Design a protein around this ligand. Structure first.
Ligand code: A1AG0
Ligand code: A1AG0
Ligand code: A1AG0
Ligand code: A1AG0
Ligand code: IMP
Ligand code: IMP
Ligand code: IMP
Ligand code: IMP
Lengths: 325, 325, 325, 325
């Protein structure tokens, strides 16, 4: 018999239900616990991608109440300096940095901790791999108070494995990324709404938050991911093409564009087969206006569902399942 | 676990079932109770939109047996005068007018009642909000015999809240509008066929009619909304572009067009994020021919289902659920 | 609660299951009982449409083993003569003719019986209407041995009503036609695979055959309709544009075309609202080659399912339900 | 009642679930048992098609660890020589050859066995036909140790019939082929994921492997077919257009192309109605690079699911069912 574990739902399969409300959108509280010790003012994390987050974007997002993750596609010294630029900037801004879950990253981790990184991100395409869990346990043993985010997983067993390995937060997302091709390459993936809810249910009572990573296209997707139980979302394409993101602005016909590619694309890699594409994204302008629009959407959702806080949205808001029609 | 209340159906998910009939389409009775005191000759209400209903369109629709709703996107004096133009016109025509459910609308309400409004519409994007319910209770206490329509809701709890607050009729529709973007902006919405049936079931035995507002594209949608339990439908895009609607006729290539926009669009608003789009609709001609075609479709449905009255269509007609294919 | 009778399936929702077979496609028997007295060599009926069947097409199809139905969109004398042309032609060919189920058709019926019609077709868009049933009972009382086909219905109750009224065969199809717009105009319809199976189940043990009318696009649709329980299919678009069909061949760019329209289209009608469209269909050539291709498809199905006769296909062949993917 | 055996799933209906892993993609073992005596290094079989496999392609694939099947669309002497070219080539390469399941193929079979064929393929569009089973039983009685593959089937009963008739391996696939039109022509077919799992369940404990034949578009489809229980896959379009495939390279605008057609197409046939199309496929280059890319995809799947061997992927990997969205 076919080994079907369950049916799984994506953002477009569901809608949030309007409910009794004493919440006006302008009164909604967007603060969230990223970890037990780190509280963000907005539930936004920027992707650890070489076309998305470097010190400039990490500074702009932290200023909006979120947090950036400096990508690992650079030298140890360049990354430690990128972290130093964010930390040494005025305002007491928080920063995160990504590391590979393979052998020979102890040096990179030691440098980032010294540079003052607030949260270390163990960046894996398969968080349920034994090698990833081992590296996390080792990092936890060496740095007992360091805030660690481990990912990516898309199951209850995967979330429990990362929490047991020492993770301060668990990142969810196997195949939902706008630039992902793993569903076609490996045939592997879990629709994000089910992936998040499963990971959240597995971690109930532990105080370990879940980050919904990948596939956020609109502010409505942000709202859905949070009501599925995520404490925050991680975005790539939503912040790609912004002024603050790395790389140069390019002109095609008349419209301005920026590069956006998966970290598993042929370009980002230069022997695994690619699991990501290389694309062009339209120039979005300043990050501040993007965040204001998206958070505004989230605020209006909170008004419609009568959820005054992120925690209320996470635990009270209900969904309806819809057809393709 | 994912908090899925139920699966919800839209117009395209269902079809009406043909049944034994002694009803010829030309013999079908289209009259309906809008409220316990107001009976319409056709189950048609025009949308309270600045690109749809002003005195001219309200006069033409009332002449066809329906009722118009003068939009709130004007001064108090202009609106009271628009109501006076419809009331003072010969034929003893009925009119409705829309008001916001916020603070400082008591003055607008007093002026509309003085002008002779037959039905006051409390026009909210979220009828289940405490502020909306409070304003309704206050209006009911001040004007005990005034016919009041409150909306919008899309749940059984929302319909009960509006009926308990004093509403003479409840308006249903969260996200189905042709110009709506709330599903993408907030992630909130309820497919209209389920939304209507839920609200109708909640109000059974109360004598409070349900209005199906939004997403009516064809006469088949009208028939479906009524068999889902609605006593009448409210239409925006179906009457936009008609000769009688406000605004000027514009020429693009050779074809004539008129403006059609959500009341939550950037244009209609000029700090909430927009929940509606701004568009162009083809010039439809006289309202009379549109109503004759649409009511004709409804008449043929009534013949096919053997339902001689609106009340029979509401309570007897059955559906089949269909796939995307 | 929403009055959903059941889920209903169309041709594209299902596939036939291959089974043990001793049947080669060239050995399959395509003969079928249209009525208890009329046996056809192929399960094909041509539509009673003014762009499909007149004496020329009725002669060509009867020669292939099927039967034509002369449309009612002409004078009584012209129709009686069209029937006489088919009957008086050599080969002992069978013909059918269509009549409206309204008042003042007794004269048309008397003329067709005199002209030698083998099967009278009471042609209604709503066979479950009391007026249709009454006219059938009257025709049966006047002509006790006349083969009568009544339609259209799409339910078990509708099939039983027609069989009780005196029908020799029941025609199924509410909304499946390629040129139908009733689903959009009235919101009424039943997906054809469910409609046929329901009507067949209602008539089990009665010996009254079911005709699957409308929506046949490919030979695979023919096979599915028969395995759903239909004894024969009725086709419009499949035979439109053939050399033998009425009307003139028209040239557009370089390709040859013929007119194809619903009997409920504005053109075919010239006060009901139209329930059909007016279109152009590509010139198909001789009917003989179309029938050879389509029957060939049916033969290969019979080989794949191990069904040597139409009756075996009707009662033994199984389906699988498929998704949109 | 409608005779629906069950719902059936295709590749796009499912996704593989990531799981605990100690498997790195470079460490995955791709070897598989094609039969109890024949073990392949990669789970790849090339289609027995006149636009896909001749001696040149059969040599290149065997060199990669797979096996080719020389098509039957040639003379007995040409086919025996094509088999001799592969066998006599250095490296001790294995080859297969296809034969029709009709009368007068005993001569073709005797010649292929003499030429040194490692596996005889009884090539039928309907493996559950009595004629096919009879020819297999006869071949098994004459050549008791000859490795025989019989197909095609898409049910549990069909798999059991082929295994009982003497098949060393069973081939599954009724309608999934990229160039197949049987779903439209006959209305027959079974979605491949259900077809494979059903055939595998029927053959559990017998040691008779199942080959998933048809519809493989991406490496993700390969992974899914194997986790559905197939020991190997058979590919047509994936290897069409390669340098090693038969036929000439053609130039259209600037891009290079090769012919790809079903064996049931009008062209491949030159009295059954065609069940396949004739098309052009882009020139893919050397087979070696195609296999490296596709096997790489399979390796990454094995890493994601924690399945170190083909047998582990076949029996341990789980699926989630997804919607169209
Ligand atoms: C080619 C490259 O692809 C990526 C890179 C980054 C990703 N980042 C996040 C996600 C995915 C990613 C894929 C795919 C799943 O969804 C989330 C890659 C890099 N290193 C390891 C793998 C791998 N290991 C196993 Cl085991 C199977 N393949 C893949
Ligand atoms: C921007 C503007 O958008 C509209 C306007 C009119 C509407 N009229 C009807 C409907 C919708 C509408 C949206 C959306 C839901 O479906 C029906 C708006 C105006 N004032 C309040 C809101 C709001 N309050 C909460 Cl709380 C959340 N957002 C939204
Ligand atoms: C306009 C015209 O439309 C047709 C004509 C022929 C048809 N022939 C077959 C079918 C349909 C047809 C619709 C629609 C349903 O599917 C099968 C029409 C002609 N006379 C009566 C009706 C009618 N009576 C009720 Cl009561 C409701 N409307 C409709
Ligand atoms: C026209 C030709 O078509 C093919 C040829 C090769 C195929 N090879 C594999 C598959 C299919 C094929 C169809 C269709 C089903 O899926 C797999 C054909 C050749 N000889 C027999 C048949 C046949 N016999 C029965 Cl009985 C019904 N029709 C069909
Ligand atoms: O090449 C890749 N393949 C698959 N997923 C990737 C790749 N690179 C990054 N990702 C993921 O995709 C996310 C961005 O998704 P987006 O916001 O939908 O564009 C990142 O945060 C990663 O988890
Ligand atoms: O900006 C907006 N966003 C969402 N819904 C709106 C907006 N403006 C009006 N509506 C609703 O949409 C209805 C019109 O829907 P339509 O008939 O499908 O075009 C109105 O009666 C309102 O209930
Ligand atoms: O105007 C019309 N509307 C709806 N159905 C029609 C109309 N005219 C004919 N039909 C039906 O459509 C059938 C033809 O369907 P087709 O074979 O799919 O084109 C006829 O046999 C009638 O039952
Ligand atoms: O004409 C045909 N019709 C249907 N299936 C065919 C035909 N010719 C070959 N096939 C099947 O299609 C397979 C190739 O499928 P593909 O890999 O999806 O292109 C072959 O291995 C056969 O089983």
């Amino acid at each position: 018999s076919l080994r079907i574990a369950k049916e799984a739902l994506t953002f477009d399969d569901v809608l949030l239900v309007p409910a009794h409300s004493t919440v006006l959108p302008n009164t909604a509280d967007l603060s969230t616990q990223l970890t037990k010790t780190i509280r963000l003012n907005i539930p936004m994390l920027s992707a650890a991608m070489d076309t998305v987050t470097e010190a400039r974007l990490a500074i702009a997002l932290a200023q909006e109440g979120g947090i950036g993750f400096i990508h690992k596609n650079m030298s140890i010294e360049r990354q430690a300096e990128e972290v130093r630029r964010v930390k040494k900037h005025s305002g007491g801004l928080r920063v995160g940095a990504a590391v590979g879950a393979g052998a020979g990253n102890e040096e990179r981790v030691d440098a980032l901790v010294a540079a003052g990184v607030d949260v270390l991100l163990i960046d894996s395409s398969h968080g349920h791999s034994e090698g990833v869990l081992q590296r996390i346990r080792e990092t936890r043993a060496k740095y007992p108070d360091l805030q660690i985010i481990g990912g990516n997983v898309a199951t209850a067993a995967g979330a429990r494995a990362l929490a047991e390995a020492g993770c301060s937060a668990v990142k969810v997302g196997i195949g939902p990324g706008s630039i992902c091709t793993t569903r076609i390459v490996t045939g592997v993936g879990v629709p994000q709404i089910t992936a998040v809810a499963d990971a959240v249910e597995a971690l109930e009572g532990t105080g370990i938050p879940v980050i919904a990573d990948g596939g956020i296209r609109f502010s409505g997707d942000i709202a859905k991911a949070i009501a599925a139980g995520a404490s925050a979302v991680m975005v790539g394409s939503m912040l790609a093409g912004t002024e603050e993101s790395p790389g140069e602005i390019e002109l095609y016909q008349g419209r301005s564009y920026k590069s956006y590619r998966g970290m598993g694309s042929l370009g980002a890699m230069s022997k695994l087969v690619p699991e990501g594409i290389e694309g062009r994204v339209a120039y979005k302008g300043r990050l501040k206006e993007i965040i204001h629009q998206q958070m505004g959407g989230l605020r209006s959702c909170m008004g419609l569902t009568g959820c005054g806080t992120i925690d209320e949205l996470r635990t009270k808001a209900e969904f309806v399942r819809i057809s393709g029609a």
